[PDB]
Design an enzyme around this catalytic site. Structure first.
Site, PDB file in Angstrom:
ATOM      1  N   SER A  11      47.173  33.998  38.844  1.00 24.76           N
ATOM      2  CA  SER A  11      47.148  35.242  39.825  1.00 24.76           C
ATOM      3  C   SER A  11      48.302  35.421  40.573  1.00 24.76           C
ATOM      4  O   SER A  11      48.671  36.586  40.887  1.00 24.76           O
ATOM      5  CB  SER A  11      45.634  35.528  40.513  1.00 24.76           C
ATOM      6  OG  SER A  11      45.630  34.460  41.377  1.00 24.76           O
ATOM      7  N   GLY A  63      43.568  34.687  36.700  1.00 27.64           N
ATOM      8  CA  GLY A  63      42.420  33.631  36.189  1.00 27.64           C
ATOM      9  C   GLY A  63      42.865  32.432  35.187  1.00 27.64           C
ATOM     10  O   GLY A  63      42.047  31.654  34.871  1.00 27.64           O
ATOM     11  N   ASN A 103      43.784  27.390  39.865  1.00 23.30           N
ATOM     12  CA  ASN A 103      42.328  27.639  39.137  1.00 23.30           C
ATOM     13  C   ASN A 103      41.927  26.158  38.241  1.00 23.30           C
ATOM     14  O   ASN A 103      40.894  26.020  38.071  1.00 23.30           O
ATOM     15  CB  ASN A 103      42.356  28.569  37.817  1.00 23.30           C
ATOM     16  CG  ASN A 103      43.009  29.869  38.751  1.00 23.30           C
ATOM     17  OD1 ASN A 103      42.478  30.089  40.067  1.00 23.30           O
ATOM     18  ND2 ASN A 103      43.479  30.828  38.182  1.00 23.30           N
ATOM     19  N   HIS A 280      45.493  36.957  47.873  1.00 23.35           N
ATOM     20  CA  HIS A 280      46.447  36.854  47.012  1.00 23.35           C
ATOM     21  C   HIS A 280      47.637  37.644  47.876  1.00 23.35           C
ATOM     22  O   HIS A 280      47.330  38.393  48.763  1.00 23.35           O
ATOM     23  CB  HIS A 280      46.622  37.632  45.919  1.00 23.35           C
ATOM     24  CG  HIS A 280      45.635  36.842  44.965  1.00 23.35           C
ATOM     25  ND1 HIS A 280      44.262  37.110  44.851  1.00 23.35           N
ATOM     26  CD2 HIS A 280      45.708  35.937  43.934  1.00 23.35           C
ATOM     27  CE1 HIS A 280      43.544  36.485  44.050  1.00 23.35           C
ATOM     28  NE2 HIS A 280      44.639  35.777  43.230  1.00 23.35           N
TER      29      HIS A 280
END
Length: 302
Positions: A11, A63, A103, A280
């Site tokens: 992301s 993700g 992640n 983000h």
């Protein structure tokens, strides 16, 4: 001279929150890959400095875990399964740039642990690490509790998988210069600053996250940064250390912020709703990303 390039990542490369999204209406809409992510903007900038990247694929996707580089990514709700990102590489690929890592550590699981608000249905993938332990106690859980060993296990899988990421690139695109992009700094050295809401915002930078958990979160980001640096050094890659220069462009730097807030509205509209940033990069944060990456590519190509 075209420089065949592949962009890959999670992301922070896809730039979740920036709209419009690429492939709005197809399977990859669930990647939330902005049309204007740092890769798009870096190509532009470089073009007018005379560096001509022939972009062969930009397969970053929200993700993505490190191993999604070599495994199929399953998108939300049954969208589909995307091919391993390694599949975008070609023997003639000369440049590979992306961010992979957050992640696998499970920075999302660390945010959800620290916030009850985040523990309710959201578009932020993941589950709390200890879901019975309580939100409010999260800075103990990770510093002294079970969280603390959980982290050392996550960090060990991270170190191993980054090396493997670097070797698969080396294998499929043997002539490619490898650029690992780091994550921008989320929390500043002075946490007191997070205690204010950003000009025009009603929610705090990090919503309900206990203020006490704030410096742990940074500790953990620093760590991941050192892991990424190491992995790159040991693997023949270049590293774009965004953390070292966004120390005053955090989520807590008010109007100079380059990270949208946890619950702040992104530009993403699903039915008639803005989807939060979820920490983000925002427009400013995306220009820093772009600038710094473009800087580094320029350097490496000279």
């Amino acid at each position: 001279d075209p420089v065949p390039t592949v962009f890959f990542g999670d992301s922070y490369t896809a730039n979740f929150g920036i709209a419009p999204v690429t492939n709005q209406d197809s399977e990859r809409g669930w990647c939330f890959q902005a049309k204007e992510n740092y890769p798009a903007v870096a190509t532009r900038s470089l073009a007018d400095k005379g560096i001509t990247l022939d972009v062969q694929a930009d397969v970053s996707c929200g993700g993505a875990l490190i191993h999604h580089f070599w495994e199929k990514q399953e998108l939300p709700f049954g969208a589909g399964e995307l091919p391993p990102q390694q599949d975008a590489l070609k023997q003639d690929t000369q440049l590979t740039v992306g961010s992979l890592g957050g992640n696998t550590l499970g920075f999302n699981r660390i945010l959800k642990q620290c916030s009850d608000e985040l523990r309710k249905p959201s578009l932020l993938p993941g589950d709390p690490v200890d879901g019975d332990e309580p939100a409010a106690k999260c800075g103990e859980f990770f510093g002294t509790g079970d969280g603390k060993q959980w982290l050392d296990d996550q960090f060990e899988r991270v170190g191993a998988e980054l090396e493997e990421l670097l070797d698969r690139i080396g294998y499929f695109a043997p002539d490619a210069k490898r650029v690992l992009v780091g994550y921008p700094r989320l929390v500043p050295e002075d946490t007191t600053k997070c205690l204010t809401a950003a000009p025009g915002q009603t929610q705090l930078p990090f919503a309900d996250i206990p203020q006490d958990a704030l410096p742990v979160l940074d500790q953990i980001q620093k760590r991941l940064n050192d892991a990424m640096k190491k992995a790159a050094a040991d693997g023949g890659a270049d590293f774009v250390d965004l953390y070292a220069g966004t120390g005053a462009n955090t989520a807590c730097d008010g109007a100079d912020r380059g990270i949208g807030g946890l619950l702040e509205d992104s530009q993403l509209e699903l039915l008639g709703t803005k989807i939060p940033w979820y920490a983000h990069p925002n427009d400013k944060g995306r220009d820093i990303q772009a600038k710094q990456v473009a800087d580094k590519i320029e350097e490496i190509l000279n």
